[PDB]
Amino acid sequence: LRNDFYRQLVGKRILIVVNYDIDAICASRILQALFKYDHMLYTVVPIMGVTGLKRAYGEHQGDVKYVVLVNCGGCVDIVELLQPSDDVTFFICDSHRPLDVCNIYSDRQVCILGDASLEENIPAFETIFYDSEGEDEDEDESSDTEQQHDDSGAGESDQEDQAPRSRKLSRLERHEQRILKQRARRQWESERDRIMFEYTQFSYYGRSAALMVFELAWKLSKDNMDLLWWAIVGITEQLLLGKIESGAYTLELEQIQSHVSRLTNKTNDQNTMSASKITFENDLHLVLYRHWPVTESMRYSRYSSCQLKLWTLRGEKRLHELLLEMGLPLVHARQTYGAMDLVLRKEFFSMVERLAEKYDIADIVYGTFTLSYGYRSRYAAADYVYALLAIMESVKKHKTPEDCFLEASDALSRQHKQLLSAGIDQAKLLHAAVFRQVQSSLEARQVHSAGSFFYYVLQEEHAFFSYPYALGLLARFLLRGHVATSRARQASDLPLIASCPLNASEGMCLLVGIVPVREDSPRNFFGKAFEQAAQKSGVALLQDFFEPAVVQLRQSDLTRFLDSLTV
Amino acid sequence: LGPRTEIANRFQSFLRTFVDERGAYTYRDRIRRMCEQNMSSFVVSYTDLANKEHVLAYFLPEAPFQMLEIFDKVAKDMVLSIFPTYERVIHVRISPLIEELRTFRKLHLNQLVRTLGVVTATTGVLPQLSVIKYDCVKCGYVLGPFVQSQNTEIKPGSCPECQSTGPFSINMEQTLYRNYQKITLQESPGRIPAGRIPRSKDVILLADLCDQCKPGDELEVTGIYTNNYDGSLNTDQGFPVFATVIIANHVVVKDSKQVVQSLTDE
């Protein structure tokens, strides 16, 4: 809580705007407003990894006491990181769930926004940072160390019955004096059945970046309805169960309903031009449903493509034969929905909810929003994150990537929209350059069993996919095709690998991988799994990214690495 | 008419119930195939028609035109009763016993016919009509005769625009068309009866049967023999100026320069 600490927020600070994300700029660009509200001058930062972290703060070495932590924290006992932390406060609103308690405890310059269903790490700092064996933090027979040292009385301290602390078992003797180590490893390790089961099994994330910030500012008599749309960007970034597990998807159908079915600054005069009060609507999260013809969707939909095999023609025979039950035209089924005749686009959605009942794809419809600025338009709630990431363009001019991070922050203004359609120049063509090796894949059958998973690697770059995140998508695009449709469950469901050719960046074998179908809540051991081969051997490995699921090799230090990675 | 009572019933008795070849006769699926193909050219074979009712050969050619309309209406009444869905966006075909050039004759007019030919140079494509709207000069109210009308007049002074408008006006709007391109016929140099007169005759096709022909190339047609609407009628010279016209129902390839083997595979 900071209803009290926000009262403190006057003196100098840094609002770093945390590592690569949608949600950051959503949950920060709000705050360039609030700072000019309370008359605060500011400074904000691009982060791509721990590289950026001190390479810049080493340039900003003050004692600036009010400091942020979002999308970060699972990196260092960050006093170990920022040793110039003496009393310089940090601020926690991070979504990275698995973090170390060393930054929770020693709670000098950190603030716990803590409420959760995990009472499993209670003394984990009281032993882990407290114990050791073959330990020197003790007295000795020598007359030099017969003084009050940091007598931790622990697995740090003596094993000759000179130690105040360690009331856990007997100190005179259990069966001998030296059984202290035995119980120390027992107590150390027997919980590492759970502790090292934490942080060495998988990784996943928490919650929002500005939902609290809405509620923080909800008290401030602030009906900045615009900011709600800024908010939902971060919501449907990863509340979407199509990407990341929410559950609260179906339980904030109450809350934000309880927000905005409640919150109505105009019950009487809301039907006019600028930013009419919003709606919730039961809609899709379909592949860019609105602005281009159906025949873009009916191919480019994974939820169609998962169940129907549409890269080939039987899908299309299945397609149109299901358009029998609608009896849609075809010319109209190849122009933009918004451009079609009108009773069709109007009437269209109403029947699809019901006459998708029988054709294996019933779960295309979800809950969403929709609103505008004026009368040029009706932008769409879900139709916004995807044009953004066309500006996350992996140009190697050395100027674009940092600077285009700034353009994003200039993007979500009402004033700045000419740029915005440029994404749509870029986005769709990506989305159908998607197939550009897929049907070359499913028929080449470039899926590799590779033991206890499924496995793929690409060996030729895309200027598109130099940029990293689509690597996950293509991985998420195909195993449905052959691996999930021509098989039984025993021979189908296993996770996958997805390599990234850096045909330009000197050769370093970038990669991501993902779980099998219908195993989502089974969080990915890939949170650690790639440490398997690396922990054993490791060869020039990197974890320079903030992300867990992310790596970087050499051109040729991947196969024997992968051979170690068999397990 | 009376007998058409039976015909529609007899049609609907087979287009989705009579079957050969171990079930699921195509007609039950052909309709929807063409429907999902936006094509509108349901095809038949007289063989299976004959397998159903061989009475379908001799109350027919008293007027083969009524057979096709009576079939087109079964179509419409089968399409939208089952697919009212796609009702906001027919003709049929037959395609099997050969007759020869210069064997159609005086007697082979306007009957069940199956006939052949070859292509040469001809004209482009153009549209035709179906429907009667002309009126609006006095009162010009909406009257609306109840048919698309081919060659029909009444011409009263009484017609429902205050039963008026003995004088006349004309519309240039709300007016159905249907493309059409003319042919030229030719006959084969394989089947020559030794240098007889060279075949070329007035023969016709229609909107859907269009934009496919090519010179000195061949296509077998169902075809049915008629004459020009008026071949030079006046008390006149020592001969009438008569030609005679044929018109296309189904066009069925004679060349097949592409893949030639239908359902050799061994």
Coordinates of C-alpha atoms in Angstrom, one line a residue, chain A residues 19-541:
Chain A
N19 CA 12.0 -4.1 -19.2
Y20 CA 10.5 -4.8 -22.7
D21 CA 6.8 -5.1 -22.5
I22 CA 3.4 -3.8 -23.5
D23 CA 2.2 -3.5 -20.0
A24 CA 5.1 -1.2 -18.9
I25 CA 4.2 1.6 -21.2
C26 CA 0.5 1.0 -20.4
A27 CA 1.3 1.3 -16.7
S28 CA 3.8 4.1 -16.9
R29 CA 2.7 6.6 -19.5
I30 CA -0.1 7.2 -17.0
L31 CA 2.6 8.3 -14.6
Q32 CA 4.3 11.0 -16.7
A33 CA 0.9 12.6 -16.2
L34 CA 0.8 12.2 -12.4
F35 CA 4.3 13.6 -12.0
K36 CA 3.4 16.8 -13.8
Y37 CA 0.3 16.7 -11.6
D38 CA 2.2 17.0 -8.3
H39 CA 5.0 19.1 -10.1
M40 CA 7.6 16.4 -10.4
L41 CA 10.3 16.4 -13.1
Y42 CA 11.2 12.9 -14.1
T43 CA 13.4 10.6 -16.0
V44 CA 12.7 7.3 -17.6
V45 CA 14.6 4.5 -19.1
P46 CA 14.7 1.7 -21.7
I47 CA 15.5 -1.8 -20.3
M48 CA 16.2 -4.8 -22.5
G49 CA 18.1 -6.7 -19.8
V50 CA 20.5 -6.5 -16.9
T51 CA 22.9 -4.9 -19.3
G52 CA 20.9 -1.7 -19.3
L53 CA 20.5 -1.9 -15.5
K54 CA 23.9 -0.6 -14.2
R55 CA 25.5 0.4 -17.4
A56 CA 23.3 3.5 -17.1
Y57 CA 22.8 3.8 -13.4
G58 CA 26.6 3.8 -13.2
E59 CA 26.1 7.0 -15.1
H60 CA 23.4 8.1 -12.7
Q61 CA 25.2 7.4 -9.5
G62 CA 23.5 9.6 -7.0
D63 CA 21.5 8.7 -3.9
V64 CA 18.2 9.3 -5.5
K65 CA 16.0 7.7 -2.9
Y66 CA 12.7 6.8 -4.6
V67 CA 13.2 4.0 -7.0
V68 CA 11.1 1.6 -9.0
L69 CA 10.9 -2.2 -9.3
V70 CA 8.5 -3.5 -11.9
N71 CA 9.0 -6.5 -14.2
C72 CA 12.2 -7.1 -12.3
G73 CA 13.5 -8.3 -8.9
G74 CA 14.1 -12.0 -9.8
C75 CA 17.7 -11.0 -10.7
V76 CA 19.8 -10.2 -7.6
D77 CA 19.6 -9.7 -3.9
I78 CA 19.5 -6.3 -5.4
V79 CA 21.5 -4.7 -2.7
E80 CA 24.2 -7.1 -4.0
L81 CA 23.3 -5.5 -7.3
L82 CA 23.2 -1.9 -6.2
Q83 CA 25.7 -1.8 -3.4
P84 CA 25.2 2.0 -3.6
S85 CA 21.9 1.3 -1.9
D86 CA 22.3 2.6 1.6
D87 CA 18.8 3.9 2.3
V88 CA 17.7 4.6 -1.3
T89 CA 14.2 3.2 -1.3
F90 CA 13.0 0.8 -4.0
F91 CA 9.4 0.3 -5.0
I92 CA 7.8 -3.0 -5.8
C93 CA 4.9 -3.5 -8.3
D94 CA 6.5 -6.3 -10.4
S95 CA 4.6 -9.1 -12.1
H96 CA 7.5 -11.6 -12.0
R97 CA 6.1 -14.0 -9.5
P98 CA 9.2 -16.1 -8.5
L99 CA 11.4 -13.7 -6.6
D100 CA 14.0 -14.2 -3.9
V101 CA 13.2 -13.5 -0.3
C102 CA 16.6 -12.0 0.3
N103 CA 15.1 -8.9 -1.4
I104 CA 11.9 -9.4 0.7
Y105 CA 13.7 -9.7 4.0
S106 CA 16.6 -7.5 4.9
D107 CA 13.7 -5.1 4.2
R108 CA 15.6 -1.8 4.2
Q109 CA 14.7 -0.2 0.8
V110 CA 11.9 -2.5 -0.4
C111 CA 8.2 -2.6 0.1
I112 CA 6.1 -5.8 0.1
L113 CA 2.7 -5.5 -1.7
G114 CA 2.1 -8.9 -0.2
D115 CA -1.0 -11.0 -0.3
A116 CA -1.0 -14.5 -1.7
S117 CA -1.9 -18.2 -1.2
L118 CA 1.6 -19.5 -0.5
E119 CA 2.7 -20.1 3.1
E120 CA 5.6 -22.3 2.2
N121 CA 8.8 -20.1 2.4
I122 CA 8.6 -18.9 6.0
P123 CA 12.2 -19.3 7.5
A124 CA 13.7 -19.9 4.1
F125 CA 16.1 -16.9 4.7
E126 CA 16.6 -18.0 8.3
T127 CA 18.5 -21.2 7.1
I128 CA 19.6 -20.7 3.5
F129 CA 21.6 -17.5 4.2
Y130 CA 22.2 -18.8 7.7
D131 CA 23.8 -22.2 7.3
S132 CA 26.9 -23.8 5.8
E133 CA 29.2 -26.8 6.5
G134 CA 33.0 -26.9 6.9
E135 CA 32.5 -23.5 8.2
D136 CA 34.8 -20.8 9.6
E137 CA 32.5 -18.2 11.3
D138 CA 33.6 -19.5 14.6
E139 CA 36.2 -19.6 17.4
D140 CA 39.2 -21.9 17.2
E141 CA 41.9 -23.5 19.3
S142 CA 44.0 -20.5 18.2
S143 CA 44.1 -17.6 20.6
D144 CA 43.3 -15.1 17.8
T145 CA 39.6 -15.9 17.4
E146 CA 38.6 -16.1 21.1
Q147 CA 36.4 -13.0 20.7
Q148 CA 32.8 -12.2 19.9
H149 CA 32.8 -12.3 16.1
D150 CA 29.7 -12.6 13.9
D151 CA 29.0 -15.7 15.9
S152 CA 26.1 -16.9 13.7
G153 CA 25.8 -19.9 16.0
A154 CA 24.8 -21.8 12.9
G155 CA 26.1 -23.9 10.1
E156 CA 28.2 -20.8 9.7
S157 CA 29.5 -21.0 13.2
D158 CA 31.5 -23.6 15.2
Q159 CA 31.1 -27.3 15.7
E160 CA 32.9 -27.6 19.0
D161 CA 30.1 -26.4 21.3
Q162 CA 30.9 -22.7 21.2
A163 CA 27.9 -21.1 19.6
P164 CA 24.9 -19.2 21.2
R165 CA 22.5 -19.8 18.3
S166 CA 21.3 -23.1 16.7
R167 CA 18.6 -24.1 19.2
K168 CA 17.3 -26.5 16.5
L169 CA 18.7 -29.7 18.0
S170 CA 21.2 -30.6 20.8
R171 CA 24.7 -29.0 20.8
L172 CA 26.5 -31.0 23.4
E173 CA 26.0 -34.1 21.4
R174 CA 23.3 -35.8 19.4
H175 CA 25.4 -38.9 19.2
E176 CA 28.6 -36.9 18.7
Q177 CA 29.6 -33.2 18.6
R178 CA 30.0 -33.3 14.8
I179 CA 26.5 -34.4 14.0
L180 CA 25.7 -30.7 13.7
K181 CA 26.7 -30.9 10.0
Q182 CA 24.4 -33.9 9.5
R183 CA 21.3 -32.2 10.9
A184 CA 22.4 -29.0 9.1
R185 CA 22.3 -30.7 5.7
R186 CA 19.1 -32.4 6.7
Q187 CA 17.4 -29.2 7.7
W188 CA 19.1 -27.3 4.8
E189 CA 18.2 -29.9 2.2
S190 CA 15.0 -31.6 3.4
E191 CA 13.1 -28.4 2.8
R192 CA 15.0 -27.8 -0.5
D193 CA 12.8 -30.7 -1.5
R194 CA 10.5 -27.7 -1.7
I195 CA 13.0 -24.7 -1.8
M196 CA 15.1 -25.9 -4.7
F197 CA 11.8 -27.2 -6.1
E198 CA 11.2 -23.5 -6.2
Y199 CA 13.3 -21.5 -8.6
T200 CA 14.7 -24.6 -10.3
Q201 CA 11.5 -26.2 -11.7
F202 CA 9.7 -23.6 -13.8
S203 CA 8.8 -19.9 -13.8
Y204 CA 5.7 -17.9 -14.3
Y205 CA 4.3 -14.4 -13.7
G206 CA 1.9 -12.6 -11.3
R207 CA -0.4 -9.7 -12.1
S208 CA -0.9 -6.3 -13.7
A209 CA 1.2 -3.2 -13.8
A210 CA -1.4 -0.5 -13.5
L211 CA -4.6 -2.2 -12.2
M212 CA -3.5 -1.3 -8.7
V213 CA -2.5 2.1 -10.2
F214 CA -6.1 2.5 -11.4
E215 CA -7.3 1.6 -7.9
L216 CA -4.6 3.7 -6.4
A217 CA -6.0 6.6 -8.4
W218 CA -9.6 5.5 -8.1
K219 CA -9.6 7.3 -4.8
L220 CA -8.5 10.5 -6.5
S221 CA -11.8 11.3 -8.0
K222 CA -10.3 10.4 -11.4
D223 CA -12.7 9.2 -14.1
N224 CA -10.0 9.3 -16.8
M225 CA -12.0 6.8 -18.9
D226 CA -9.3 7.1 -21.5
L227 CA -6.9 5.5 -19.0
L228 CA -9.2 2.4 -18.7
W229 CA -8.5 1.7 -22.3
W230 CA -4.8 2.2 -21.5
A231 CA -5.4 -0.2 -18.7
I232 CA -7.0 -3.1 -20.7
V233 CA -4.0 -3.1 -23.0
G234 CA -2.0 -4.6 -20.2
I235 CA -5.0 -6.8 -19.3
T236 CA -5.5 -8.5 -22.6
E237 CA -1.8 -8.7 -23.0
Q238 CA -1.6 -11.6 -20.6
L239 CA -5.1 -12.0 -19.0
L240 CA -5.9 -13.5 -22.4
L241 CA -6.0 -17.3 -21.7
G242 CA -5.2 -17.6 -25.4
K243 CA -1.7 -16.6 -24.4
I244 CA -1.2 -16.7 -20.6
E245 CA -3.3 -18.3 -17.9
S246 CA -5.6 -15.8 -16.1
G247 CA -8.6 -17.6 -14.6
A248 CA -9.6 -14.2 -13.4
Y249 CA -10.7 -13.7 -17.0
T250 CA -13.9 -15.3 -16.0
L251 CA -13.8 -13.7 -12.5
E252 CA -13.1 -10.1 -13.5
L253 CA -16.2 -10.4 -15.7
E254 CA -17.5 -9.5 -12.2
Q255 CA -14.9 -7.0 -11.2
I256 CA -14.5 -4.7 -14.1
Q257 CA -18.2 -5.2 -14.6
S258 CA -18.4 -4.1 -10.9
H259 CA -16.2 -1.2 -12.0
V260 CA -18.0 0.0 -15.1
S261 CA -21.4 -1.5 -14.8
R262 CA -21.1 0.5 -11.6
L263 CA -18.9 3.4 -12.7
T264 CA -20.9 5.8 -14.9
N265 CA -19.8 9.5 -14.8
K266 CA -22.7 10.1 -17.3
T267 CA -26.0 8.2 -16.8
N268 CA -27.8 10.9 -18.8
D269 CA -25.4 12.6 -21.3
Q270 CA -23.0 10.1 -22.8
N271 CA -24.0 9.9 -26.5
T272 CA -21.7 12.4 -28.1
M273 CA -18.4 12.7 -29.8
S274 CA -15.2 12.5 -27.7
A275 CA -14.7 9.2 -26.0
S276 CA -18.2 8.0 -25.2
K277 CA -18.4 5.9 -22.0
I278 CA -17.3 2.4 -22.7
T279 CA -19.0 -1.0 -23.2
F280 CA -18.2 -4.5 -22.2
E281 CA -19.1 -6.8 -25.0
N282 CA -19.1 -10.6 -25.5
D283 CA -16.8 -10.8 -28.5
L284 CA -14.0 -12.9 -29.8
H285 CA -10.3 -12.9 -29.3
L286 CA -10.2 -14.2 -32.8
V287 CA -7.3 -13.3 -35.1
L288 CA -8.1 -9.7 -35.9
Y289 CA -11.8 -10.2 -36.4
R290 CA -12.9 -6.8 -37.6
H291 CA -11.1 -4.9 -40.2
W292 CA -10.4 -7.3 -43.0
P293 CA -12.4 -10.1 -44.8
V294 CA -13.3 -13.4 -43.3
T295 CA -10.9 -15.2 -45.6
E296 CA -8.0 -13.7 -43.6
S297 CA -9.4 -15.1 -40.4
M298 CA -10.5 -18.5 -41.6
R299 CA -6.9 -19.3 -42.5
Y300 CA -5.0 -17.2 -40.0
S301 CA -6.9 -18.5 -36.9
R302 CA -5.1 -21.1 -34.8
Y303 CA -8.3 -21.9 -33.1
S304 CA -9.7 -22.7 -36.6
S305 CA -6.3 -24.2 -37.7
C306 CA -6.1 -26.3 -34.5
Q307 CA -9.3 -28.2 -35.2
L308 CA -9.7 -28.0 -38.9
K309 CA -6.3 -28.2 -40.8
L310 CA -6.8 -25.2 -43.1
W311 CA -3.4 -24.9 -44.6
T312 CA -4.7 -27.6 -46.9
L313 CA -8.0 -27.7 -48.9
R314 CA -10.2 -30.0 -47.0
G315 CA -10.5 -27.2 -44.5
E316 CA -11.8 -25.0 -47.2
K317 CA -14.2 -27.6 -48.4
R318 CA -15.2 -27.9 -44.7
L319 CA -15.1 -24.1 -44.5
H320 CA -17.6 -23.2 -47.2
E321 CA -19.8 -26.2 -46.4
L322 CA -20.1 -24.7 -43.0
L323 CA -20.8 -21.3 -44.6
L324 CA -23.7 -23.2 -46.1
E325 CA -25.4 -23.0 -42.7
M326 CA -24.9 -19.2 -42.9
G327 CA -25.1 -19.0 -46.6
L328 CA -22.7 -16.2 -46.8
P329 CA -21.7 -14.7 -50.2
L330 CA -18.2 -15.1 -51.5
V331 CA -17.3 -11.7 -52.9
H332 CA -18.4 -10.4 -49.5
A333 CA -16.4 -13.2 -47.9
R334 CA -13.3 -11.7 -49.5
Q335 CA -13.8 -8.0 -48.7
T336 CA -13.4 -6.3 -45.4
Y337 CA -16.2 -6.9 -42.9
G338 CA -16.4 -3.2 -42.2
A339 CA -16.6 -2.8 -46.0
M340 CA -19.2 -5.4 -46.7
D341 CA -22.9 -4.8 -47.0
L342 CA -24.4 -3.9 -43.8
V343 CA -27.2 -6.2 -42.5
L344 CA -24.6 -8.9 -42.9
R345 CA -21.8 -7.4 -40.8
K346 CA -24.5 -6.3 -38.4
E347 CA -26.3 -9.6 -38.2
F348 CA -23.2 -11.7 -38.6
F349 CA -21.8 -12.3 -35.1
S350 CA -25.2 -13.2 -33.6
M351 CA -25.4 -16.6 -35.3
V352 CA -21.8 -17.7 -35.0
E353 CA -22.1 -18.1 -31.3
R354 CA -24.7 -20.7 -31.8
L355 CA -23.9 -22.3 -35.2
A356 CA -20.3 -22.9 -34.0
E357 CA -21.9 -25.4 -31.7
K358 CA -21.4 -28.5 -33.8
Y359 CA -18.1 -27.9 -35.6
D360 CA -15.4 -28.4 -33.0
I361 CA -14.7 -24.7 -32.4
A362 CA -17.1 -23.4 -29.8
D363 CA -14.7 -21.2 -27.9
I364 CA -13.9 -18.4 -30.3
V365 CA -16.2 -16.0 -28.3
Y366 CA -15.0 -14.2 -25.2
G367 CA -15.6 -11.0 -23.3
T368 CA -14.1 -7.6 -24.4
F369 CA -14.6 -3.9 -24.8
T370 CA -15.0 -1.4 -27.7
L371 CA -14.9 2.4 -28.1
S372 CA -13.8 5.3 -30.2
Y373 CA -12.6 8.8 -30.4
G374 CA -15.1 10.3 -32.9
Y375 CA -16.8 9.5 -36.2
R376 CA -13.9 8.6 -38.4
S377 CA -13.8 5.4 -36.6
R378 CA -14.7 2.7 -34.2
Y379 CA -11.4 1.2 -32.9
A380 CA -11.7 -2.1 -31.1
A381 CA -10.6 -3.2 -27.7
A382 CA -8.8 -6.4 -28.8
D383 CA -7.6 -4.9 -32.1
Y384 CA -4.8 -2.8 -30.6
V385 CA -1.9 -4.8 -29.1
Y386 CA -1.0 -6.3 -32.5
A387 CA -0.3 -3.1 -34.5
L388 CA 2.0 -2.1 -31.6
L389 CA 4.5 -4.9 -32.1
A390 CA 5.1 -3.9 -35.7
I391 CA 7.0 -1.0 -34.2
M392 CA 9.0 -3.5 -32.2
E393 CA 11.0 -3.9 -35.4
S394 CA 14.4 -5.5 -35.2
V395 CA 16.3 -3.1 -37.5
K396 CA 20.1 -3.2 -37.1
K397 CA 20.7 0.5 -37.7
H398 CA 21.7 0.6 -33.9
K399 CA 19.2 3.5 -33.6
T400 CA 15.8 1.9 -34.1
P401 CA 15.3 -0.5 -31.1
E402 CA 15.8 2.0 -28.4
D403 CA 14.1 4.8 -30.3
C404 CA 11.2 2.8 -31.5
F405 CA 10.6 2.0 -27.8
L406 CA 9.9 5.7 -27.4
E407 CA 7.5 5.8 -30.4
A408 CA 5.4 3.2 -28.6
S409 CA 5.0 5.6 -25.7
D410 CA 4.0 8.3 -28.2
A411 CA 1.6 5.8 -29.8
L412 CA -1.2 5.4 -27.2
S413 CA -2.1 9.1 -27.3
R414 CA -5.3 10.2 -29.0
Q415 CA -3.2 12.8 -30.8
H416 CA -0.8 10.2 -32.3
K417 CA -2.5 7.8 -34.7
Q418 CA -1.3 8.3 -38.2
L419 CA 1.7 6.2 -37.1
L420 CA -0.6 3.6 -35.7
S421 CA -2.0 2.3 -38.9
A422 CA 1.5 1.7 -40.1
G423 CA 1.5 -1.3 -37.8
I424 CA -1.3 -2.7 -39.9
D425 CA 0.8 -2.3 -42.9
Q426 CA 3.3 -4.4 -41.1
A427 CA 1.2 -6.8 -39.0
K428 CA -1.1 -8.7 -41.3
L429 CA 1.7 -9.5 -43.8
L430 CA 3.6 -11.0 -40.9
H431 CA 0.6 -13.0 -40.0
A432 CA 0.5 -14.7 -43.4
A433 CA 4.2 -14.7 -43.8
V434 CA 3.5 -17.1 -40.9
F435 CA 2.7 -19.9 -43.2
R436 CA 5.7 -19.1 -45.4
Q437 CA 7.6 -22.2 -44.2
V438 CA 4.7 -24.0 -42.4
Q439 CA 3.3 -25.9 -45.2
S440 CA 6.9 -26.4 -46.2
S441 CA 7.2 -27.8 -42.6
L442 CA 4.2 -30.0 -42.1
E443 CA 4.8 -31.8 -45.3
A444 CA 8.6 -31.8 -45.0
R445 CA 7.7 -33.1 -41.4
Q446 CA 10.6 -31.1 -39.9
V447 CA 9.2 -31.9 -36.5
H448 CA 11.9 -33.9 -34.6
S449 CA 11.0 -36.3 -31.9
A450 CA 14.3 -35.9 -30.2
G451 CA 13.4 -38.1 -27.2
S452 CA 11.2 -37.0 -24.4
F453 CA 9.6 -34.0 -26.2
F454 CA 9.1 -32.7 -29.7
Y455 CA 11.8 -30.7 -31.4
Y456 CA 12.3 -28.2 -34.2
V457 CA 15.1 -26.0 -35.3
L458 CA 15.2 -23.4 -38.1
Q459 CA 18.4 -22.7 -40.0
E460 CA 17.6 -19.6 -42.1
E461 CA 16.6 -16.3 -40.9
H462 CA 13.7 -14.0 -41.5
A463 CA 14.2 -10.3 -41.4
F464 CA 10.9 -10.5 -39.7
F465 CA 11.9 -13.0 -37.1
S466 CA 15.3 -11.5 -36.2
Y467 CA 12.8 -9.8 -33.9
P468 CA 12.3 -12.5 -31.2
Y469 CA 8.8 -13.1 -30.1
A470 CA 7.3 -14.5 -33.2
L471 CA 9.6 -17.4 -32.6
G472 CA 7.2 -18.5 -29.9
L473 CA 4.3 -18.1 -32.3
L474 CA 5.5 -20.3 -35.1
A475 CA 6.3 -22.8 -32.4
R476 CA 2.7 -22.2 -31.2
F477 CA 1.4 -22.5 -34.7
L478 CA 2.3 -25.9 -36.1
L479 CA 2.4 -28.7 -33.6
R480 CA -1.3 -28.7 -33.8
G481 CA -1.0 -29.4 -37.6
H482 CA 0.9 -32.7 -37.8
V483 CA 2.0 -33.5 -34.3
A484 CA -1.5 -33.0 -32.9
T485 CA -3.4 -34.1 -36.0
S486 CA -2.2 -37.3 -37.2
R487 CA -2.0 -39.2 -33.9
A488 CA -3.4 -40.4 -30.6
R489 CA -2.8 -38.6 -27.3
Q490 CA 0.0 -41.0 -26.2
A491 CA 1.9 -40.1 -29.4
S492 CA 0.8 -36.4 -29.7
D493 CA 1.2 -34.4 -26.4
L494 CA 4.7 -33.3 -25.6
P495 CA 6.3 -29.9 -25.5
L496 CA 8.4 -28.2 -28.2
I497 CA 11.5 -26.3 -29.1
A498 CA 11.8 -23.4 -31.6
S499 CA 15.1 -22.2 -32.8
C500 CA 15.9 -18.7 -34.2
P501 CA 18.5 -18.3 -37.0
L502 CA 20.5 -15.2 -36.6
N503 CA 21.8 -15.3 -40.2
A504 CA 23.0 -11.7 -39.6
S505 CA 24.2 -11.4 -36.0
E506 CA 27.3 -13.6 -36.5
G507 CA 25.6 -16.9 -35.5
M508 CA 24.5 -17.6 -31.9
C509 CA 21.5 -20.0 -32.1
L510 CA 18.7 -18.2 -30.3
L511 CA 15.7 -20.3 -29.1
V512 CA 12.4 -20.5 -27.3
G513 CA 10.1 -23.5 -26.5
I514 CA 6.6 -24.2 -25.3
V515 CA 4.3 -26.9 -23.7
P516 CA 2.0 -29.3 -25.6
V517 CA -1.7 -28.6 -26.4
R518 CA -4.2 -28.8 -23.5
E519 CA -1.4 -28.6 -21.0
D520 CA -1.3 -24.8 -20.2
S521 CA -1.5 -24.7 -16.3
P522 CA 1.3 -27.3 -16.4
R523 CA 3.9 -24.4 -16.2
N524 CA 6.9 -25.0 -18.4
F525 CA 9.9 -26.6 -16.9
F526 CA 11.6 -24.6 -19.7
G527 CA 11.6 -22.0 -16.9
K528 CA 14.7 -24.1 -16.0
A529 CA 14.8 -27.0 -18.4
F530 CA 17.5 -25.5 -20.6
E531 CA 19.7 -25.2 -17.6
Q532 CA 19.7 -29.0 -17.7
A533 CA 22.3 -29.2 -20.4
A534 CA 23.9 -26.0 -19.3
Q535 CA 24.2 -26.7 -15.6
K536 CA 25.9 -30.0 -16.4
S537 CA 28.3 -28.5 -19.0
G538 CA 27.3 -25.1 -20.1
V539 CA 29.0 -23.6 -23.1
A540 CA 29.0 -19.8 -23.6
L541 CA 25.4 -19.7 -22.3

